């Protein structure tokens, strides 16, 4: 086994190297044309190569959700997860950033929604519909409230699940993602912070 394994791997390396030297691959920044001049990138609509959009290279964001509007925040969050943010957009793939939400339990809502709004899950039984209010749920598990608001705006389907994971909601103010240096989120809206 050993002999044939090492010998096989020595061929696998060489054949890997033979192709790596056959046509090369940029990143973004760049200028229209180059010394690639292979298949027509220019009259064929752009479509991302996996080499571009790897999950390490993706940007990060943090939202402090204190004294905000739940829905208005969530739309921007959804946008920044999708990648409609970015010029290089593609519906088929996720090329969007991550999002981190903190102080989810201090998020605000207009009108008489703190009592009247109901969050329902139905166990999947002949009896069990379980329905609890906004504030009642917030006392227990406030994470959901943001999380649920966001998932409703993301595109449901195989992608919808995968790029949902990118949301990171939290109860309190501090968060454990200091390593990633997540920058602050830009916010298109006038109504987004509450009157106070």
């Amino acid at each position: 086994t050993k002999c044939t394994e090492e010998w096989r791997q020595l061929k696998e390396a060489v054949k890997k190297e033979f192709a790596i030297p056959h046509v090369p691959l940029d990143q973004r920044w760049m200028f229209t044309l180059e010394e690639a001049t292979g298949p027509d990138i220019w009259n064929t609509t752009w479509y991302p190569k996996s080499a571009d959009h790897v999950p390490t290279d993706k940007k990060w964001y943090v939202v402090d959700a204190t004294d905000l509007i739940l829905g208005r925040m969530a739309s921007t969050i959804a946008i920044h997860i999708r990648g409609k943010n970015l010029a290089s957009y593609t519906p088929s793939v996720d090329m969007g950033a991550f999002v981190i939400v903190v102080n989810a339990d201090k998020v605000a809502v207009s009108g008489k929604k703190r009592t009247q709004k109901l969050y329902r899950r139905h166990s999947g039984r002949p009896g069990g519909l379980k329905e609890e209010t906004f504030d009642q749920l917030q006392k227990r598990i406030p994470e959901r409230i943001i999380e649920h608001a966001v998932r409703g705006m993301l595109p449901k389907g195989r992608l919808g699940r995968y790029l949902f994971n990118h949301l990171k909601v939290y109860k309190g103010a501090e968060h454990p993602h200091q390593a990633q240096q997540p920058i602050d989120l830009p916010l298109r809206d006038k109504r987004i912070r509450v009157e106070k």
Partner: protein, 116 residues
Amino acid sequence: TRVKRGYIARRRRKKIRFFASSFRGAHSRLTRTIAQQKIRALVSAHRDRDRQKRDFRRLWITRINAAIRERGVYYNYSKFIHDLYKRQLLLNRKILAQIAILNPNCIYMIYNEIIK
């Protein structure tokens, strides 16, 4: 003069099968079901070629919109298009969106000297 059919049947049903020989399961190998399915394949092709033309455009518009919103805080696709025709400038959506990808410098340059 009895006329057996023989040759004439499966010489066409081979051609029928030649289409469907990437299909998955029963559809690939069952004469009459292949004949039922090939038609539908061609119909979905013909239908989607016209969907293509509008859907690519719709993608391009989103690309351009995404690109242009990164300039001024209140500047937006809708205004951008009317600003192009205000200056008389016949760049179609394909070119605009593809330069927005492959050379964002050039969109910066077009954005700079359209405003004035």
